Amino acid sequence: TTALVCDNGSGLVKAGFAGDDAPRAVFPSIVGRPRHQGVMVGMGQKDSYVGDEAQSKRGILTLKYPIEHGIITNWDDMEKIWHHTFYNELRVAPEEHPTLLTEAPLNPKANREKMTQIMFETFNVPAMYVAIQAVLSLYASGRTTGIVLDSGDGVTHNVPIYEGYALPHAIMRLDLAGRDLTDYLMKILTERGYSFVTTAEREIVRDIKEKLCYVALDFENEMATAASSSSLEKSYELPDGQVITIGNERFRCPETLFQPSFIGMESAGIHETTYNSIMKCDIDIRKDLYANNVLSGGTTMYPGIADRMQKEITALAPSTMKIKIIAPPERKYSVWIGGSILASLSTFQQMWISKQEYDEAGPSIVHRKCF
Amino acid sequence: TTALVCDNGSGLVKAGFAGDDAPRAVFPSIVGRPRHQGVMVGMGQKDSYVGDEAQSKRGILTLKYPIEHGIITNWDDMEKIWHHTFYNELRVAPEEHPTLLTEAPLNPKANREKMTQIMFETFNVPAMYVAIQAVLSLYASGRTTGIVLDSGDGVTHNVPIYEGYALPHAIMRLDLAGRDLTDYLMKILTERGYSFVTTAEREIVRDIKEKLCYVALDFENEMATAASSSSLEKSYELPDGQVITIGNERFRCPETLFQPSFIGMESAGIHETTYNSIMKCDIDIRKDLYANNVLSGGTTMYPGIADRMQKEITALAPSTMKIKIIAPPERKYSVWIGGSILASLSTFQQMWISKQEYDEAGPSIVHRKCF
Amino acid sequence: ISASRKLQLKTLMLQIAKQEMEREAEERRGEKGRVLRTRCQPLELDGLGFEELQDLCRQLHARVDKVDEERYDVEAKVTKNITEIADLTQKIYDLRGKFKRPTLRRVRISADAMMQAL
Amino acid sequence: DDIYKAAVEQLTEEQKNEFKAAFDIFVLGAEDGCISTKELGKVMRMLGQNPTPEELQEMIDEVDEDGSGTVDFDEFLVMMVRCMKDDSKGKSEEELSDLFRMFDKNADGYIDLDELKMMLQATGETITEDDIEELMKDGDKNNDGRIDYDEFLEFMKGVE
Amino acid sequence: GKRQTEREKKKKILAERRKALAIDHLNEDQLREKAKELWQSIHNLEAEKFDLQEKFKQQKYEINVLRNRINDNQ
Numbered sequence A, B: 001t002t003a004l005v006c007d008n009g010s011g012l013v014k015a016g017f018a019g020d021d022a023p024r025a026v027f028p029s030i031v032g033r034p035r036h037q038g039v040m041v042g043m044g045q046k047d048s049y050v051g052d053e054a055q056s057k058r059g060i061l062t063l064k065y066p067i068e069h070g071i072i073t074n075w076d077d078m079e080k081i082w083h084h085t086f087y088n089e090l091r092v093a094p095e096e097h098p099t100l101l102t103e104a105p106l107n108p109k110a111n112r113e114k115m116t117q118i119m120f121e122t123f124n125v126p127a128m129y130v131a132i133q134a135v136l137s138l139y140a141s142g143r144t145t146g147i148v149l150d151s152g153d154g155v156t157h158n159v160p161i162y163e164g165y166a167l168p169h170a171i172m173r174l175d176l177a178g179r180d181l182t183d184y185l186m187k188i189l190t191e192r193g194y195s196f197v198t199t200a201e202r203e204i205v206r207d208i209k210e211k212l213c214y215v216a217l218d219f220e221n222e223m224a225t226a227a228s229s230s231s232l233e234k235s236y237e238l239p240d241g242q243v244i245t246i247g248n249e250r251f252r253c254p255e256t257l258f259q260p261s262f263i264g265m266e267s268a269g270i271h272e273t274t275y276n277s278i279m280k281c282d283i284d285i286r287k288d289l290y291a292n293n294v295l296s297g298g299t300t301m302y303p304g305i306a307d308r309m310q311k312e313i314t315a316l317a318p319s320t321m322k323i324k325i326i327a328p329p330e331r332k333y334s335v336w337i338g339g340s341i342l343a344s345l346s347t348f349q350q351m352w353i354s355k356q357e358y359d360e361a362g363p364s365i366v367h368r369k370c371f
Numbered sequence C: 001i002s003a004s005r006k007l008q009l010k011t012l013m014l015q016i017a018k019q020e021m022e023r024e025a026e027e028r029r030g031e032k033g034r035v036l037r038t039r040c041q042p043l044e045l046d047g048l049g050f051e052e053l054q055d056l057c058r059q060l061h062a063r064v065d066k067v068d069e070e071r072y073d074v075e076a077k078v079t080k081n082i083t084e085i086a087d088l089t090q091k092i093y094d095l096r097g098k099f100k101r102p103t104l105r106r107v108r109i110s111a112d113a114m115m116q117a118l
Numbered sequence D: 001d002d003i004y005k006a007a008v009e010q011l012t013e014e015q016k017n018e019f020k021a022a023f024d025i026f027v028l029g030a031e032d033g034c035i036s037t038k039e040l041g042k043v044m045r046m047l048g049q050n051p052t053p054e055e056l057q058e059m060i061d062e063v064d065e066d067g068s069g070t071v072d073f074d075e076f077l078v079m080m081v082r083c084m085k086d087d088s089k090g091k092s093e094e095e096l097s098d099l100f101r102m103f104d105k106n107a108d109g110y111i112d113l114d115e116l117k118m119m120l121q122a123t124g125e126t127i128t129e130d131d132i133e134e135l136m137k138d139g140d141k142n143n144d145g146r147i148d149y150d151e152f153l154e155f156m157k158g159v160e
Numbered sequence E: 001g002k003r004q005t006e007r008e009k010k011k012k013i014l015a016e017r018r019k020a021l022a023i024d025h026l027n028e029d030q031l032r033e034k035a036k037e038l039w040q041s042i043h044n045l046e047a048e049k050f051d052l053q054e055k056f057k058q059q060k061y062e063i064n065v066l067r068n069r070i071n072d073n074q
């Protein structure tokens, strides 16, 4: 039979059968209970709208993501999300399909063990396998080397790989991602008068960020230009009218990636953690990693980031090496495409964690040889 | 058995069995004791004529409404009105019929508790339920969202509802209604020479208001036109002859709705309390409320109000949203039609306040789960 | 186009549909019996010694546990699927028939000829 | 063809009250019961009955084609009784959906015309002007290339 | 993951809450009767299992119907 390539993610759940080009169903991972009282009788009001249904009734819900930073903080809601994904968005019972979840690097063990225990006890799948979210993104590019920066919505991690041999001592995981950029944008919009507070209006700020923000090639020059002319002010229409005008908030929101001091984080930007991740590698594979830097994940879709990052790394790196940044147009679904490719391989067909194996060793089987 | 859908109202009591199209008996709610001495013996003169009987002998009575502004100020008279409604206008003993009263929003608790205590002790009904007068008017329109402006004769209230979930923090109740318009019309008629003082002549002024007054599309232009031409002066024949001619009093009486400063009230008109009630709602359901504005209640029957209100709201609202005002021809009985529909539902059949429940918790049961 | 055969055609279609429903019920029952026989083998109770009964009932009890697991699984499945079907049916009705539930009325009946009585 | 015909052959007094009321409205005695379809519809709307002009116009297009303006008692009574809602609510919606899913073998989210033709020929009924394309004409509302159970209701709702 | 109640119920039904029955401890006639009871219970319950599979069929039919209706209407 065919395998189910699910990809929990944090912000958008992407799923679909193995062997295709794009995920079949992509929908936000939010579960929102209603918060008001409700007076109409017999309206058929449910107790929790999940997935894309709660992005249409969000006016009277309190949306809450069940995955904070890669890790899962609310297991009941995550179980509800998985149940919805299997039964309503794909309509395939899990009793007859292997599953291939994905997990960020350096995550707590208990999260992974609970994930496998749920998949084997509640949904009762035949066999499931957990894979690191960066190796798949390297599969999708058709490479076999390269250092991949997978800046998702929950957590940004940077896994270097050479000739198929991952370097476990050079993984640099940073917890700045799309959600923190949304919060920072929502916080700097208040400097013009627009106040978004409700958890429903966070979605509106996310839409503003997606449609308007861009990464500046040079930050100081843009700050000077936006403060003199008015060629940058782009307007946007809220879900009820009252258009708003975003000035130099456009390139200040995604600039947080390269200067995490804006949101008070100490660490260095995504332009310098890649160079540090390279320098921890051996001295003889640094040229190949320099030449095959891969971008993935949703948050790396800002217009103009593949040039800013290249300029920064070229500034840091030695002058002789060639710096090349692979930015495929299908960046958002790169991890899932790689997952489909991996699940479609014949050599991989014996790596699944078969159910009888789980019955013999318990949920701690995932840390064992079947990784 | 069938349920009795009574609707106390303030000015007209509307009642009838559940499941029909129109109330069976509609009659003014006035109780008038005779005031003169009376010399004929054996004429069979009663001590209080209630309902529609006191609108024919009103020449020698002192009519007094038992409901001032939604609240009930004279419980003995209200009990008399209910007794008349049950026994003479419907001729069904209440011992064998559930009842569904209606109550304005934000009313004193003691009023509701006394109402249920009367219905359970004096009339001894099997089960009664109290419902908010705006949710029913939303039932009758066949919608499930929308913000309903129910401008009755006692009190005007504006309850917004979305997807069946009422928003309790956005109810704007204003105490200007048909009765204050009658008093203001009676007060401005004195500018031509016609003086109505007696409580019986208030009924004549009410008839004048119903038959002649209309809401102007633009107030200043109408004031200028009525002051130059004479195309507006419509005449009306009193109950004894001596026709009267109403000039620009025609559109000045109902204009008080949009400018409550005429009768000295501070608050804003019904055109601006609706917009304020909308703006208190969440940012994502404002479009639906804009598109589904519902009118109900008797006082919204003035010829030309559904255009004036739409013009005013379109002036206030953002230019992109579409403003639509639902004004069904059966506006007056909209609340009662909705009450019939609600009482005819199967899902609602277990929400009644059964008598044994009242015996166990006292009259304060109404504030509890059985709302 | 005559309204004459509308009644005959709809009655004939109702008869055909009823025959189809009863036939489907009968064939479902027969298939269920066959699947039951091939799953739970028919009970043999002849010439059996007590030890043979002990062993057979032990096998039956192990099978009882196994099939109880199977059936509580399919019972949770059917419960969840029924709930989901009801929810989606009500959602579909809301999208389509919510505007029509109020329209269910018994109106314009008495007041039509109850105006001159006053 | 036969349902209202049977009902008239067993003429009930409840309907007979209105029938004879409209008769004395029409026939004043020793008449042939002409009662033209135009006049019949006029009176049907007049005497407080169902004011549906559609059935009246159907009769007018259908009756008094003789050129004498007279309307025989048989068809006049048939159209009077069928003007009123004579149906047992057309069975049950869920039950009829099961009937149609037994009818519909494709289960492609709808049912195609050919399945309807198969069921119709299984019924074994006579064919007339309301055949062949009348179902096609009525059911092709949005012309979705199919006759769904919802489309089948739109064509001939209230199947009894 | 706060479906501990759900999966704990699953395990309880499959192992504990099932008719966990000591059966091979009975008189010859008694043990035969108990075996007959087990056999009948399996038969009736698997008939119910077939019924649930048929309900899965009907639910899938209605799912397909709803999908087609949604697509045609939107």
Ligand SMILES: Nc1ncnc2c1ncn2[C@@H]1O[C@H](COP(=O)(O)OP(=O)(O)O)[C@@H](O)[C@H]1O
Binding pocket: A008, A009, A010, A011, A012, A013, A151, A152, A153, A154, A178, A179, A182, A206, A209, A210, A211, A297, A298, A299, A301, A302, A332
């Ligand atoms: N076109 C875009 N432009 C800018 N940011 C985007 C765009 N699309 C998505 N994002 C950001 O990326 C996030 C989605 O990232 P995604 O790759 O789905 O995370 P995950 O790894 O959990 O799947 C969104 O929250 C959004 O903030």
Ligand SMILES: Nc1ncnc2c1ncn2[C@@H]1O[C@H](COP(=O)(O)OP(=O)(O)O)[C@@H](O)[C@H]1O
Binding pocket: B008, B009, B010, B011, B012, B013, B151, B152, B153, B154, B178, B179, B182, B206, B209, B210, B211, B297, B298, B299, B301, B302, B332
């Ligand atoms: N046709 C009409 N035109 C103008 N005003 C009307 C009309 N009918 C009723 N009214 C006003 O509405 C009042 C009746 O309102 P109603 O809806 O009966 O109040 P309640 O909510 O108490 O039932 C009357 O007092 C009258 O002033």
Ligand SMILES: [Mg+2]
Binding pocket: A009, A010, A133, A150, A152, A153, A297, A298, A335
């Ligand atoms: Mg990701």
Ligand SMILES: [Mg+2]
Binding pocket: B009, B010, B133, B150, B152, B153, B297, B298, B335
């Ligand atoms: Mg009212």
